[PDB]
Design an enzyme around this catalytic site. Structure first.
Site, PDB file in Angstrom:
ATOM      1  N   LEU A  81       0.838  -1.185   0.000  1.00  0.00           N
ATOM      2  CA  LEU A  81       0.000   0.000   0.000  1.00  0.00           C
ATOM      3  C   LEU A  81       0.873   1.234   0.000  1.00  0.00           C
ATOM      4  CD1 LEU A  81      -2.732  -0.960   2.611  1.00  0.00           C
ATOM      5  CD2 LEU A  81      -2.989  -0.933   0.132  1.00  0.00           C
ATOM      6  N   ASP A  82       0.305   2.388  -0.306  1.00  0.00           N
ATOM      7  CA  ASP A  82       1.093   3.611  -0.414  1.00  0.00           C
ATOM      8  C   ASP A  82       0.915   4.543   0.757  1.00  0.00           C
ATOM      9  OD1 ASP A  82       1.988   2.813  -2.877  1.00  0.00           O
ATOM     10  OD2 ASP A  82       0.630   4.084  -4.033  1.00  0.00           O
ATOM     11  N   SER A  83       1.714   5.582   0.822  1.00  0.00           N
ATOM     12  CA  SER A  83       1.635   6.466   1.959  1.00  0.00           C
ATOM     13  C   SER A  83       0.226   6.968   2.176  1.00  0.00           C
ATOM     14  CB  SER A  83       2.590   7.654   1.757  1.00  0.00           C
ATOM     15  OG  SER A  83       2.494   8.181   0.451  1.00  0.00           O
TER      16      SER A  83
END
Ligand SMILES: CCCCCCCCCCCCCCCCCC(=O)OC[C@H](COP(=O)(O)OCCN)OC(=O)CCCCCCCCCCCCCCCCC
Ligand SMILES: CCCCCCCCCCCCCCCCCC(=O)OC[C@H](COP(=O)(O)OCCN)OC(=O)CCCCCCCCCCCCCCCCC
Ligand SMILES: CCCCCCCCCCCCCCCCCC(=O)OC[C@H](COP(=O)(O)OCCN)OC(=O)CCCCCCCCCCCCCCCCC
Ligand SMILES: CCCCCCCCCCCCCCCCCC(=O)OC[C@H](COP(=O)(O)OCCN)OC(=O)CCCCCCCCCCCCCCCCC
Ligand SMILES: CCCCCCCCCCCCCCCCCC(=O)OC[C@H](COP(=O)(O)OCCN)OC(=O)CCCCCCCCCCCCCCCCC
Ligand SMILES: CCCCCCCCCCCCCCCCCC(=O)OC[C@H](COP(=O)(O)OCCN)OC(=O)CCCCCCCCCCCCCCCCC
Ligand SMILES: CCCCCCCCCCC[C@H](O)CC(=O)SCCNC(=O)CCNC(=O)[C@H](O)C(C)(C)COP(=O)(O)O
Lengths: 55, 95, 276, 126, 178, 89, 65, 123, 124, 459, 73
Positions: F43-45
């Site tokens: 997942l991303d920030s």
């Protein structure tokens, strides 16, 4: 934890409210007028801890 | 970010202790070691009130005063015996 | 007081339209109805004002405890935003809520109807401020609107409350009193109006649009609001009007008169009267 | 519309230019100030969490406040203008205002009573 | 509430903390759910673009115009949870959170009942005094060379030692006293 | 009664696991407690912000910003939620 | 013992539904019963006179001049 | 609310009545020996029925009837219904009067405006 | 930044930002929880007024001026419109109500001995 | 009235002769009964004042007080058993005797026929009080406070001494009975306009007026609890009792020579009430509450209408009892907290459930809740003040709103809110602390049932 | 009793208003990731649309049935 105190103030409110209702001389009307004010103060801020209730 | 490897152990450990505190807070069996009526408070209060209202108030002057009773045309007055005259006839029947 | 009662009626009602707290909306309605009560006292019609006090008590008490039921049954959610479809999940309170809502909106032949329309048509027939007469009637349409706001958001909508559901209103202590007041809300206006002593010599003779004005304004008030509630569901951004926030933060009387007075009344004691 | 901070309704943290600053000097303070607080924090947190203690944690920062506010005032008083003009308008201003408010009323009342107009009806008390 | 406040905020945490206020202030405007979930994946897009801007100056110029766009497009009554600061139940139950150092002045009669409760309480108080020395010493032996100092406190780092300044994060009055 | 049953950790544990299994990006057949969001699941920030927000809406309370910039492991979420709600199991 | 339900429509007790339909149905029986017996919600039962149809004789409007 | 107001407030009020002075013209004007109102009830009957001063209208007489049938027939508050229609009617038949009087005063004022101009013969 | 030296007593007490405890981060574990003030941090001169149960200085979504103008505008427009109202009232087409006897002269408590100028009301 | 007095004197022998361990109970138990003998004076079955003997008299105005003066000695000795229990057994017996002499002197001053007997006894009460404040005062500043309490009263006192010797020459006896039944009508000269000020000023000083009240905040701050109770309950009211008996003469001048004070007091009432609103020391706030509620009294003893006077008599007895109650509970917080600061110690009800009920009732007495003599009092002064000038309600109307605010703020920031994290743990309440309170309020409840007894000379 | 939880798979976006939001979002190219979580709202039990007349008219059917009968007697 304090259900009984809460019920106690509710009836005291009713006693002041009815005194305010059936008051011939206005001194008694005043006793009711101020009286519901103070118990409202005690009962609006039931949960004294919360500052919002105190405000 | 992500917890610092030395803060995921101060939360690791202190949570472990909080879990024990809350277990200890749990009460053991026995923990708490302690060592129609309707008529009652409707009738008993009543007798007293009545005693007070019919033998103090009633007795004292101007303590229980009441608006005059209503007397309409054609209705009799019990105390004096008079019969209130019937009123002048209503002429209209128009609905 | 006819004048200030009138200003509070609309001022409070307009504020209620955008408030998103269920208890807050009912409270504003408490103030708006008393604003109508103040108006009748201002038009020197004391007996009917008292009649509304009694009828007002039955339905407002119901709606609050109705929301008491919803708030307690849900995980103490006091916001209409996260509360939805109570009608299927909890029919007992929803039934009580709409009974109360219609009484608040003066549904014909319910306790509000016996006393409230007497007050409305009293206005439409007396000599009064034109501004007061117009605001009181739209105040009545708004009462229908915010009444509509509560049932649409609280009851008739897809549920938006937190995912685990634990709702119980079976407790006799909930139903019984709610049930008992509901009986009062349904029959009290019938009983009180016939029994009270003839008073005030009302004017039952009116052009029909004034005779039926309370009924129609209440009807379109909901109609217009229902259009509004319906509008939102679309995937198009409406947000709200510039005066909408003015409405949502209570007319800004709280934001401004609560920060200036307590500030310039305490500054003067410490800085000027006490130390100087 | 640009938010416009007033002495009240102040500029929020966001919308505040200063917040948007990385000039290494600024960051220097912002990290120096935590130290003062962290230091003070680790001087409250191992003296309040100290077993074997009964004495009253003092919070001397509150004692410096009360002394500054009720016992360090007159030792720092210098009578200037804007202080004595404003120190006389406050003590004698209203005190002279109400005198001409009460004298004029009391005099109006007295005249009317003297001339015979004041009704003083059903007033059997005073 | 648990972890300590960082001194200055980074660029990221400022951007990523708008994504929260923003999306959460978009669910007051979008009272429904399908409308919301729609109008929000469109929000991410806004943040999704301008993600790889390498030009800091620019990035801090998109952020400063985002938080002004937001301030003027925020909801006056946001949906703030029931038990969070500013909420409706915030600090409601605090009238029942007595601070636990008060069971020490109880009459020997009161503490007579509730017997095993105090048998375990006296154990924990022995734990607290048994480590204050090893703790404070730890707190000190590990005082990093004087310099930046943050409010973060160290873990245990040795068996038997109780992760320090712990008596009030553990032994905290329970949230809902009820 | 009216108040729901108190959360038991092994439940809260399953509840946080569950919601993620409904996030499309996070594989439903790998989400494994101790599977960090940005290092393992990918997942991303910006996702994390949402994953947390879902949890804040599944359990009905707000994970403060500073304490939630770190709800990385899919487990930290399960003890932090429980610690904040006093579940000693 | 109501069982908390997760992502499902809370099961409802017999009584909850019947009492709710009961209160609402009586509301409607009362509104319908009174409407039939007393329909003076509309028109009252006294018609407004058209003030503009009063023969000038009716009001004392003298014959101009 | 109504048009009548528009006449007075909008346009011109010359011929619109002033509510404060409704019988503005001569009472007899327009009527040879107009009959005055008549009251069935007795200054005393009312005083003995304790009718609120306001309720002492020319319908006071049908009221006393209602009140009679409301004290009598006590447990039954839904049976003095004919009596209420009557009172109300009496009053509707009074409101109408108060409307006829207002319309008459309107028209008469107009007479003045017409006549003035007519009587204002050029020469 | 010492409070300005105008000799009103402030002395050396720091002039801390005039911001109320209301916007102090509501999540951080403030030593003194309710004053949202830590132990040691300089207390504000007027912390008896900025307390939470008192005045607030917390940014508002609407600018303050915009608030003051709008509120009072509303107030004024209303007050004014109410005046437009008193000028142009709403009154039905109904003449004056007619009370019997001499407008109830005696019963309105009038003097029994002195009869009043008869006020008569005629039909139609 | 030598039973209310001689048995009192004998208390002194008992405090000294008695055992160190039993000294406290002999003294407190006996003066409770001394109060019971005091109650006999209340038996007035006729209007005639009761002239016990040449020098000693008791009329409706003095009787309600003599009983209060006798009543508080028991209470004062019960509130100071804690502090003053760390002393050497001869410092105690001095404090107990000092408290005993105050009511011996105060009982006589309130029960004195000759006005100069009032002066000698009046100004003597300073000796016992100054010792109580200075010798046992906790703070570094009591030496200063003592100076302020001695000079403000003393500079006022010598003018009264000259004035009373002056009237004796002008009339020929300072006997309150005769002075009343004799023709002493001042002649509105410039000099008389000074006499009036000479007689009233000494009384106006110990009854804090807005201009000279700085002595009372400073004195009660560092004074021990027993001294603060005496100053608020009996000491300040000495000034009011004096103004009632001295204005029998100087009858014509106060009609026009009062305006200055009346306005000083009513504006003073507002400012003194307001600074209570932001004062960090609780004892400080109660003291300014005392100044404002006493500023009402000097504005009723000057309007001079029957209702004012008994409004005054009602309020003085009532506020006396209420203030002590507030000063007594303030001390209980001070002894466990160890600081006078109002901001610390938040949330006590959570830890001291009952003291909070006493705090609530004391505050409701402080503000005017209606079935209380406190309200009847203000309602009456308010009425007359309105009669003097209808505008007075504005100023006596800003005070009521402010009085509500500070009275509840004392309850809201001391007895509600979250508990203070960990001040020295607050030991539970002693039964003495609670009784000392109960003894203050149970009489406040009983007097409110039959207000006639404390109504004053006028009615 | 170790409350169980409905199979995560059960939830699907088709058949609910989320699907139409899903399709327009797909037109823009966005994937609407958390839509599946918001499915039980519309999934079942609470699936039926609630119309405003339905609430105002709840129980009207029997209410009128009751009225007719009473009117008859
Ligand atoms: C609550 C606040 C207190 C209210 C107190 C109300 C009662 C006061 C009262 O009058 O009771 C005592 C009274 C004593 O007798 P006395 O007053 O001399 O009456 C003689 C009349 N010729 O009466 C007696 O002692 C005689 C015996 C009476 C026994 C029953 C008393 C019932 C009083 C009910 C009063 C209710 C109203 C107040 C509370 C509401
Ligand atoms: C053709 C001829 C027709 C003759 C009848 C005409 C219709 C008359 C209708 C009168 C209805 C009166 C009524 O039903 O009262 C119920 C009551 C109303 O409200 P109430 O609680 O009395 O509050 C007012 C207090 N002043 O509300 C209550 O008392 C609540 C009682 C709760 C418990 C009720 C349990 C049984 C319910 C049975 C419902 C049927
Ligand atoms: C346009 C004009 C229309 C006509 C005028 C309308 C206004 C007239 C004056 C009304 C009273 C003004 C003060 C009202 C009370 C008040 O504002 O208290 C609220 C204050 C903050 O509470 P708030 O922010 O509302 O709620 C917290 C939400 N998180 O909570 C507080 O505790 C604030 C501090 C209260 C205690 C000190 C306040 C001063 C006390 C003395 C002065 C009282 C006001 C001035 C005198 C009376 C004026 C009528
Ligand atoms: C805060 C609430 C305020 C509420 C205010 C309510 C005001 C009601 C109306 C009062 C003023 C009109 C009174 C009218 C009485 C009949 C006409 C009359 O003759 O007045 C009596 C008398 C003379 O007044 P006037 O006619 O103006 O003659 C002045 C000649 N130079 O009158 C006089 O003795 C002269 C002075 C009259 C005007 C006095 C104004 C008083 C202002 C009070 C301010 C209150 C706030 C002060 C600050 C508080 C905060 C610090
Ligand atoms: C106040 C008057 C006290 C009169 C007490 C009479 C009985 C007695 O003898 O006590 C003397 C008193 C106490 O003396 P003692 O009991 O020995 O204990 C203290 C030793 N310094 O010690 C005293 O001498 C008290 C009297 C001092 C002189 C002033 C009297 C007024
Ligand atoms: C400070 C608080 C307020 C104190 C007020 C003190 C006033 C002066 C002292 C007492 C004044 C006084 O007694 O007044 C009356 C006196 C003259 O009175 P009288 O008896 O009429 O003499 C003229 C005979 N045809 O008039 C005088 O005694 C004049 C006194 C002159 C000295 C004034 C005080 C100086 C103090 C240094
Ligand atoms: C209803 C509320 C209205 C709110 C509207 C909203 O403000 C609209 C808007 O923000 S408009 C897009 C602004 N978008 C940015 O300001 C991000 C740019 N910042 C970067 O690109 C950084 O350099 C970084 C590399 C750290 C990003 O990485 P990350 O995503 O934080 O992880």
């Amino acid at each position: 934890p304090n259900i009984n105190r809460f019920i106690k103030y509710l009836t005291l409110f009713l006693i002041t409210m009815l005194i305010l209702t059936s008051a011939n001389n206005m001194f008694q009307l005043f006793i009711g007028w101020e009286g519901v004010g103070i118990m409202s103060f005690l009962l609006i801020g039931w949960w004294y801890g919360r500052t919002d209730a105190n405000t | 970010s992500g917890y610092t490897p030395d803060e995921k152990l101060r939360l690791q450990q202190l949570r472990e202790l909080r879990r024990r505190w809350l277990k200890d807070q749990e009460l053991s069996p026995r923990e708490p070691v302690l060592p129609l009526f309707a008529v009652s408070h409707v009738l008993i209060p009543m007798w007293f009130v009545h005693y007070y209202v019919k033998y103090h108030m009633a007795t004292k002057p101007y303590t229980i005063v009441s608006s005059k009773p209503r007397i309409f045309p054609g209705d009799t007055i019990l105390e004096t015996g008079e019969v209130i005259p019937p009123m002048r006839d209503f002429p209209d029947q128009h609905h | 007081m006819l004048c200030l009662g009138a200003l509070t009626t609309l001022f409070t009602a307009i504020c209620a339209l955008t408030q998103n707290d269920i208890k807050k909306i009912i409270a504003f309605s408490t103030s708006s109805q008393l604003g109508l009560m103040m108006v009748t006292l201002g038009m020197n019609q004391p007996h009917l004002a008292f009649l509304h006090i009694c009828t007002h008590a039955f339905f407002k008490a119901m709606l609050f405890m109705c929301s008491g039921s919803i708030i307690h049954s849900l995980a103490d959610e006091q916001d209409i935003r996260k509360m939805g479809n109570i009608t299927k999940i909890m029919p007992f309170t929803s039934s009580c809520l709409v009974i109360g809502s219609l009484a608040l909106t003066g549904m014909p032949f319910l306790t509000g109807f016996y006393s409230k329309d007497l007050i409305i048509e009293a206005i439409n027939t007396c000599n009064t401020n034109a501004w007061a007469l117009l605001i009181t009637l739209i105040a009545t349409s708004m009462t229908a609107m915010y009444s509509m706001r509560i049932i649409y958001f609280v009851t008739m909508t897809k549920p938006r409350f937190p995912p685990l559901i634990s709702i119980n209103e079976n407790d006799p202590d909930l139903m019984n009193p709610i049930k008992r007041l509901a009986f009062g809300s349904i029959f009290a206006g019938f009983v009180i109006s016939y029994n009270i002593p003839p008073t005030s010599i009302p004017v039952l003779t009116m052009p029909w649009f004034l005779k039926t004005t309370a009924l129609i304004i209440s009807v379109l008030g909901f109609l217009i609001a229902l259009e509004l509630n319906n509008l939102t569901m679309k995937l198009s951004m409406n947000k709200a009007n510039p005066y909408s926030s003015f409405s949502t933060l209570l007319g800004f009387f709280p934001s401004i008169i609560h920060r200036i007075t307590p500030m310039k009344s305490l500054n003067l004691s410490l800085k000027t009267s006490l130390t100087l | 519309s640009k938010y416009k901070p007033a002495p009240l309704a102040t500029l929020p943290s966001t919308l505040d230019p200063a917040e948007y600053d990385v000039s290494p000097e600024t960051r220097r303070a912002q990290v120096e100030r935590l130290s003062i607080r962290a230091r003070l924090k680790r001087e409250y947190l191992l003296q309040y969490n100290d077993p074997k203690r009964v004495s009253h944690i003092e919070d001397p920062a509150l004692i410096r406040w009360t002394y500054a506010r009720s016992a360090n005032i007159y030792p720092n008083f210098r009578p200037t203008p804007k202080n004595s003009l404003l120190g006389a308008v406050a003590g004698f201003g209203p005190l002279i205002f109400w005198y001409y408010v009460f004298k004029t009323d009391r005099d109006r009342k007295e005249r009317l009573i003297q001339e015979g107009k004041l009704d003083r009806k059903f007033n059997i008390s005073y | 509430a648990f972890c300590a406040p960082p001194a200055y905020l980074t660029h990221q945490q400022k951007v990523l903390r708008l994504y929260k206020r923003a999306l959460r202030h978009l669910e007051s405007w979008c009272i429904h759910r399908d409308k919301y979930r729609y109008f929000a994946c469109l929000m991410r897009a806004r943040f999704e673009e301008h993600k790889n801007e390498k030009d800091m100056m620019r990035a801090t110029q998109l952020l400063r115009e985002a938080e002004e766009e937001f301030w003027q497009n925020q909801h006056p009554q946001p949906y703030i949870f029931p038990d969070s600061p500013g909420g409706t139940s915030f600090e409601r139950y605090e009238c029942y959170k007595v601070p636990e150092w008060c069971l020490d002045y109880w009459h020997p009669s009161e503490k007579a009942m509730y017997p095993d409760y105090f048998s375990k309480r006296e154990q924990w108080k022995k734990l607290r005094m048994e480590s204050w020395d090893r703790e404070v010493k730890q707190l000190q032996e590990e005082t990093s060379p004087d310099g930046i100092m943050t409010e973060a406190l160290p873990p245990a780092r040795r068996e038997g030692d109780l992760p320090p300044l712990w008596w009030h994060i553990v032994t905290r009055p329970r949230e809902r006293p009820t | 009664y009216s108040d729901a049953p108190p959360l038991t950790l092994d439940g809260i544990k399953d509840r946080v696991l569950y919601v993620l299994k409904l996030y499309d990006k996070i594989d439903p057949e790998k989400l494994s407690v101790n599977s960090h969001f940005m290092k393992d699941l990918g997942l991303d920030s910006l996702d994390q912000v949402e994953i947390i927000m879902a949890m804040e809406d599944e359990f009905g309370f707000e994970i403060p910003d500073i304490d939630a910039e770190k709800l990385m492991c899919p487990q930290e979420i399960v003890d932090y939620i429980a610690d904040k709600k006093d579940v000693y199991e | 013992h109501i069982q908390p339900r997760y992502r499902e429509f809370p099961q409802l007790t017999r009584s909850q539904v019947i009492q709710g339909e009961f209160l609402s149905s009586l509301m409607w029986f009362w509104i319908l019963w009174r409407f039939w017996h007393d329909s003076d919600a509309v028109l009252g039962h006294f018609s407004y006179p058209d003030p503009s149809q009063w023969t000038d004789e009716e009001l004392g409007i003298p014959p101009d001049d | 609310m109504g048009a009548h107001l528009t006449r007075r407030y909008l346009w011109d009020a010359s011929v619109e009545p002033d509510p404060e002075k409704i019988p503005s013209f001569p009472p007899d004007l327009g009527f040879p020996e107009r009959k005055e109102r008549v009251m069935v009830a007795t200054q005393q009957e009312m005083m003995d029925a304790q009718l609120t001063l306001q309720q002492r209208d020319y319908c006071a007489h049908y009221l006393i009837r209602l009140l009679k049938c409301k004290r009598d027939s006590f447990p039954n508050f839904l049976a003095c219904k004919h009596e209420q229609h009557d009172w109300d009617y009496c009053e509707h038949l009074d409101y109408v009067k108060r409307m006829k009087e207002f319309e008459r005063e309107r028209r008469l004022l107009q007479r003045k405006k017409r006549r003035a101009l007519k009587e204002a013969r050029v020469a | 930044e010492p409070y300005p030296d105008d000799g009103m007593g402030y002395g050396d007490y720091p002039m801390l930002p005039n911001r109320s405890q209301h916007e102090r981060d509501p999540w951080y574990q403030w030593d003194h929880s309710e004053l949202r003030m830590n132990w040691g941090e300089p207390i504000h001169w007027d912390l008896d007024m900025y307390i939470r149960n008192r005045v607030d200085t917390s940014p508002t979504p609407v600018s303050w001026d915009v608030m003051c103008k709008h509120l009072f505008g509303f107030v004024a427009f209303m007050v004014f419109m109410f005046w437009v109202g008193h000028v142009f009232p709403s009154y039905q087409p109904v003449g004056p109500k007619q009370y019997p006897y001499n407008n109830l002269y005696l019963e309105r408590g009038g003097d029994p001995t002195k009869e009043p100028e008869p006020v008569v009301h005629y039909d139609i | 009235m030598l039973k209310i007095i001689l048995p009192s004197l004998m208390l002194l022998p008992l405090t000294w002769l008695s055992s160190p361990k039993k000294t406290w109970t002999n003294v407190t138990s006996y003066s409770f009964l001394i109060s019971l003998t005091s109650l006999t004076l209340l038996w007035q079955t006729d209007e005639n004042y009761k002239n016990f003997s040449n020098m000693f008299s008791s009329d409706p105005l003095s009787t309600p007080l003599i009983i209060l003066t006798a009543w508080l000695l028991p209470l004062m000795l019960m509130a100071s058993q804690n502090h003053l229990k760390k002393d050497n057994n001869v410092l105690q017996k001095l404090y107990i005797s000092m408290l005993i002499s105050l009511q011996i002197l105060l009982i006589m001053t309130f029960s004195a026929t000759e006005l100069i007997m009032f002066y000698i006894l009046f100004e003597a009460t300073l000796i016992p009080t100054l010792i109580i404040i200075t010798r046992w005062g906790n703070q570094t500043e009591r030496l200063n406070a003592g100076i302020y309490f001695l000079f403000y009263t003393l500079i006022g006192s010598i003018p009264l001494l000259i004035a009373l010797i002056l009237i004796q020459n002008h009339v020929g006896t300072l006997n309150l009975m005769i002075l009343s039944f004799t023709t002493h009508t001042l002649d509105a000269s410039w000099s008389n306009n000074l006499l009036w000020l000479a007689c009233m000023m000494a009384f106006l000083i110990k009854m804090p007026l807005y201009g000279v009240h700085l002595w009372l905040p400073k004195a009660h701050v560092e004074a021990p609890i027993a001294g603060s109770m005496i100053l608020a309950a009996i000491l300040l009211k000495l000034g009011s009792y004096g103004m009632i008996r001295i204005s029998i003469i100087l009858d014509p001048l106060t009609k026009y020579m009062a305006y200055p004070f009346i306005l000083l007091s009513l504006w003073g009432m507002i400012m003194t009430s307001s600074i209570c609103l932001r004062q960090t020391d609780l004892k400080s706030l109660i003291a300014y509450s005392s100044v404002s509620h006493m500023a009402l009294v000097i504005a009723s003893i000057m309007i001079q209408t029957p209702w004012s006077f008994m409004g005054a008599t009602m309020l003085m007895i009532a506020h006396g009892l209420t203030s002590s109650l507030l000063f007594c509970l303030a001390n209980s917080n001070y002894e466990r907290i160890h600081s006078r600061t109002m901001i610390m110690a938040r949330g006590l009800q959570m830890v001291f459930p009952l003291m909070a009920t006493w705090w609530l009732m004391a505050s409701l007495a402080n503000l005017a809740l209606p079935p209380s003599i406190n309200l009847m009092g203000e309602l009456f002064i308010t009425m007359s003040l309105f009669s003097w000038s209808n505008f007075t309600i504005i100023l006596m109307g800003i005070n009521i709103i402010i009085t509500g605010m500070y009275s509840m703020y004392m309850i809201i920031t001391t007895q509600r809110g979250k508990l203070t994290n960990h001040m020295i743990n607050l030991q539970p309440s002693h039964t003495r602390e609670l009784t000392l309170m109960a003894l203050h309020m149970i009489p406040l409840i009983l007097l409110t049932t039959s207000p006639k007894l404390i109504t004053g000379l006028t009615m | 009793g170790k409350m169980e939880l409905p199979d995560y798979r059960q939830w699907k976006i088709e058949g609910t208003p989320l699907e139409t939001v899903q399709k327009k979002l797909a037109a823009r190219g966005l994937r609407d990731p958390w839509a599946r979580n918001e499915a039980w709202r519309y999934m079942g039990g609470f699936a039926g649309n609630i119309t405003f007349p339905s609430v105002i008219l709840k129980g009207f059917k029997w209410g009128f049935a009751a009225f007719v009968v009473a009117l008859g007697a």
